[PDB]
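Hi C.,

You asked whether I'd gotten around to modeling the 389-residue construct. I have! Everything is below, sequence then structure, no commentary in between.
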Amino acid sequence: IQPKPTLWAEPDSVITQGSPVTLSCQGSLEAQEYRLYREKKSASWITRIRPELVKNGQFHIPSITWEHTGRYGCQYYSRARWSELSDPLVLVMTGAYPKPTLSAQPSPVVTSGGRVTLQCESQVAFGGFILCKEQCLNSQPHARGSSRAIFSVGPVSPNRRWSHRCYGYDLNSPYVWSSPSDLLELLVPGVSKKPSLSVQPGPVMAPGESLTLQCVSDVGYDRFVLYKEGERDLRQLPGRQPQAGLSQANFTLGPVSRSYGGQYRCYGAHNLSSECSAPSDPLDILITGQIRGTPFISVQPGPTVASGENVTLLCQSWRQFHTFLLTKAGAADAPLRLRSIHEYPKYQAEFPMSPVTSAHAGTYRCYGSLNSDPYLLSHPSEPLELVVS
């Protein structure tokens, strides 16, 4: 019969260094002898594999190194005939270099039908990069070597998981790759039933303090995803249903710094598919003490309030502010924001309290902000407590 043999790797043709791999040649049942060849460059010796290692067609590699990588092809002897060369197998090793960083230009979440741009970046200089989905595709083979390469994947498929992972390799050894980049998840949102976002203690945070988020949806979405407009990577956490009929997730970000301020959006999805829920109503996170100046607050007519009275707050400042903010003590919900008013020689903003209720009582603080970056607030105002009776 003498069919063309098949050459295949177990558990995969991509193996981290040191980890074991086993190849296998598959010919006829008349298989007497097994030849197995290597190849690493279009000019190398051939590097044929010795028969002391080809045991019943299975060439076992206990500890893979950057010697074993290359193109393999097997060929067996049967009926006084050497078989044809099997389809070549490319054995590739990973984990030799530090792992690069994969990112999505410009959006890590794209609407259904658009092709997103990806890029892997690294400090060290590599010859070329590889993008594998979890079918690998590389960049053009460069000669000098860049620090980052650009890929263009698309269009999107809502039924499949658009997970990606990036490698880097040297030009003189295109079969010896770097360590695996962090698993990047792409995402395609859509209808329906956008979840609800809530924050603790409040959307206005001070440095050093940490905040914990909560994304809730009555529909039983499996995992929840949250990201920032402008931010180029995502964060995923599988959501559970501790309550009867409501899925939730406690996104606990660490100590808050300047970089954490921004507009955050959450939306859910199911595990196996990538057809995700509609984006929830956005929640803005604001950081204090990140810009100069500190305003102080006053009242009118006084901090004693009777139910059925018109009271007005106001914050003054000497430094230029474009918008002012009013935050109530826990729990703060909106919080309020009105643009400034240049009442020489100060910048003020009246926060009216048009006819009051019993809920307008509590401790109130004020913040100043600019339009250079609206998510960065000034130092807090002196706390002004208000009582009602």
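If it helps when you're writing up: The CA atoms of residues 125 and 147 lie 5 Å apart.

Thanks,
B.
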